[PDB]
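Tutorial sheet, problem 5. The three components below are modelled jointly, 1068 residues in total.
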Amino acid sequence: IPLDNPAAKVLVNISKVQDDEVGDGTTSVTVLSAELLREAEKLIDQSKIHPQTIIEGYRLASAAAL
Amino acid sequence: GKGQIISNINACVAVQEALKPTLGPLGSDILIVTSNQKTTISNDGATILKLLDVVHPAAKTLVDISRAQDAEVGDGTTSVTILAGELMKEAKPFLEEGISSHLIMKGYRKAVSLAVEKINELAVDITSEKSSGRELLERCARTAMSSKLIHNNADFFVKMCVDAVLSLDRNDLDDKLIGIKKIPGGAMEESLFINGVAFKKTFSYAGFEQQPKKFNNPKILSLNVELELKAEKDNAEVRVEHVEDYQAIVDAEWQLIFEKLRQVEETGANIVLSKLPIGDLATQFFADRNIFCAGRVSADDMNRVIQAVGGSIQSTTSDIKPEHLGTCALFEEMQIGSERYNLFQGCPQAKTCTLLLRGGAEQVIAEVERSLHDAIMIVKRALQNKLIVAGGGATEMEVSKCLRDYSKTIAGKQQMIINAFAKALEVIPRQLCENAGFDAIEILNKLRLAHSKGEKWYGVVFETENIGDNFAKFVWEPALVKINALNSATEATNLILSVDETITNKG
Amino acid sequence: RQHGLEAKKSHILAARSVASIIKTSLGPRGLDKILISPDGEITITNDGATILSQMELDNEIAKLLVQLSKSQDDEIGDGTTGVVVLASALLDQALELIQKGIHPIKIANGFDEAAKLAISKLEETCDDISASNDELFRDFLLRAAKTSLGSKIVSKDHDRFAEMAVEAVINVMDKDRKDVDFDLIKMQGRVGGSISDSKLINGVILDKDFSHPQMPKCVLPKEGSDGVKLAILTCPFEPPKPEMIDDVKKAGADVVICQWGFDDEANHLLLQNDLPAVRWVGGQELEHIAISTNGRIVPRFQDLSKDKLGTCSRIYEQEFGTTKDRMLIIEQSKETKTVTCFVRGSNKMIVDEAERALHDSLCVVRNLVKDSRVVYGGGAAEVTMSLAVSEEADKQRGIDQYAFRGFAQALDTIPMTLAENSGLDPIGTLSTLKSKQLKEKISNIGVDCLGYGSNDMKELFVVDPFIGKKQQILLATQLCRMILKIDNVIISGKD
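Model answer (structure tokens):
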């Protein structure tokens, strides 16, 4: 699908990393990444603070998940 | 009818408005974008009007008269247009009252004729009275350098500026003969003066660490053709099918270049300069013979080499004559600024010089280089013309004062016309105060106080706001500028007011 | 065309909207941007020089930001985002003075006198590096690139790239002039491999496949001969279109380098003599070949001698990673006049981000050697300069009294911008930095954009060059003057 959105072109290049490194579960990566944007959208509009602070919270939460 | 005349009034004000902030050394600079997409910023009215190329006939007249002011004189191109355009505004209410513009133009011929006579009375010839030979030109350079970022370092800058004028014959002087090469980076007080000519040295190719900055007596010879054999445009194709013949069909070309060696080798020229970039072929054998070569030199700097050592440009290496060579006293090369700078020193026959400038940034030096050009014109015209007049508001106020008294004896419409011309002379000191930050309303009232006490030399102080005499401020202006400014502004104004209808045909 | 009425109002709003783009990217916590090249390549970086260079616009006021940023990369390189934000602060404070009747040149001249007095204030509170200890100076070079690379994957291997910039600046820069030439720094990188294979080379790389495979991968010493001699010839070596072998052994040139290619049978004569040939070399690559190896360019085989020919350690071929190009390494073992930056990465974007970060890292080393006295940045320098100008504003009367107050408030924009970019209250943080420097004691405490242990960066040994920060405040005042000195806008049409 041709995408004129310049933000959507980045997601295509990110999905190519999963195919070259492993190649399994490529669709699950995009689905999980889309759900992270749904929660991040509610955190911004209710805050309007730079997301880099929220990004630091994901690194602490991802360590406990592993 | 009168409708096109009114349109010509606003056309001159629009052109004048652009030159108002550019009047004076402290005045503002205008930004004009040429169709070439090149950024040009200058405070000189000549270059400003040349880049506009206005199709309007009356606005083009103000542009054409600026070239005549720059040709015969070269100074005052900004003030001649402001003074010429001011008469358009003063004559605007006179047209609605029924007064014809012909009687207005007639009053200017009698007003300027009486003003030129007063200029010679205010010009006093002084040379050795209360002044020495060395301190005469030094005090003139500090006037234009005042109220600038270089005022602290101006002590070292005046010594280098005076030596640039004294290095040339005092009978013939030109501002284009003194070159300036900007050096990015370094301290401003560490700049030095150079007797010869220098270039930008854009040559980035290898073969460094040789050709030291210390030369004895190198010989200079101009080059025309290219030393490298590489063909940029044409080519050739020859191929053979023999296997054993592939050996020698890769080999011999450059042997043909050896034909031009013995011709140049027997000459003994230690300097190789050309209008074309020198190739990568031989950077070494020249250094073995103590021969110097510099490529990627602009064509403007090549003409100064001919006027320096008396060289000549020859197409080939055959007919080059031995007497065309020339030598300097000493060579110097500096690596300051992460770039090598080549310069010649000690040329007795040099008709040009080069002054190097150093600063913190390239944009900072651009304001220092252009501020020096205003000081060079004051030093240059000091020795050329011995008749000088007091500037900085001094002369401009008295020319308007005398016309007020002489108009009382004149009857008819010419009284209010000369008084309008005298009032039109107040635009020059106005913009000088407004561009410098001083209030033009308070100074205009206070300056006319002492101006009526009988002293005609009271000027306007450009450093600290106050009224006083410019004689202590060392503000000097030549008499040829004030005389030709009134004639050029009146002639350009008379041509616009004499045209009621403008016709433009398309084709 | 607008003069004297709407010109001063439009120039402030035009420069504020352009400068507001990079305000969010200031600092290590600043946010990146997505740029699209006209060829279809997407570039993402935090450097303001890339964003401002890609801007193509007809606005005459915003053109000064592009022309100034070109000279900032060579002199400093860190004054890209910082100066533009600082220059916008002087324009916003000057807009309020225009409505009050303040002359614009007085605002331009007021910032010049306020900047010169603020420099002398930091001269008393600055600290010495070399006077404290010698090894503390090297610790600053190791952590110089760590701050800029801490936001990238490179931050894991950062300990390896720290020692590469220490030995490279010493060779190219002499303690006399204390200057580093940009033309002597060769920045080369390719796609593929990793960042752990990056090595510090004292000479030009000059990737070569050695033409015919029969040529050996190493240069023989040739019976104890001195070094390895090279020959650079750009002549179009070609057939005879409208002798030499005997003069080659006299000079002793080991390898011949050319800009263009060679035939197959041409290198067979020099093959038996163990004299390799080099072809397909760019024009810019020839600059670092003669300077690093101290070699020369052969004018001819007849008059060439052995005295001035350069000598290096050796020339060998060393494969880099899994790349099939089979690159090589040319060493020296002696101090050269130039260095070559060798950067690798697994992605094309990682290489481009690492090359630009190394450029700014080499300039900081030059500033630390040129000026030993330094100050603590990261928001502490702007707050210190603010309290110094604001305190002296009451002692200076006249029109310049208000010019010093507006200049002191303009310096507070940077620490508030760093506070806004850090996700904290800019006003609540600015009041804290001013309280610690007055009632307690005079010190340097800045705003932390990246999460650290505590305040007082002096404990963490975070230092910034003083001459590097001094060059930024001078270009900011120089840029602010050129904007106010232009009251007119003139542009032609497009046909």
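Marking note: The first strand of chain B starts at residue 30 and ends at 33. Full credit if you identified this.
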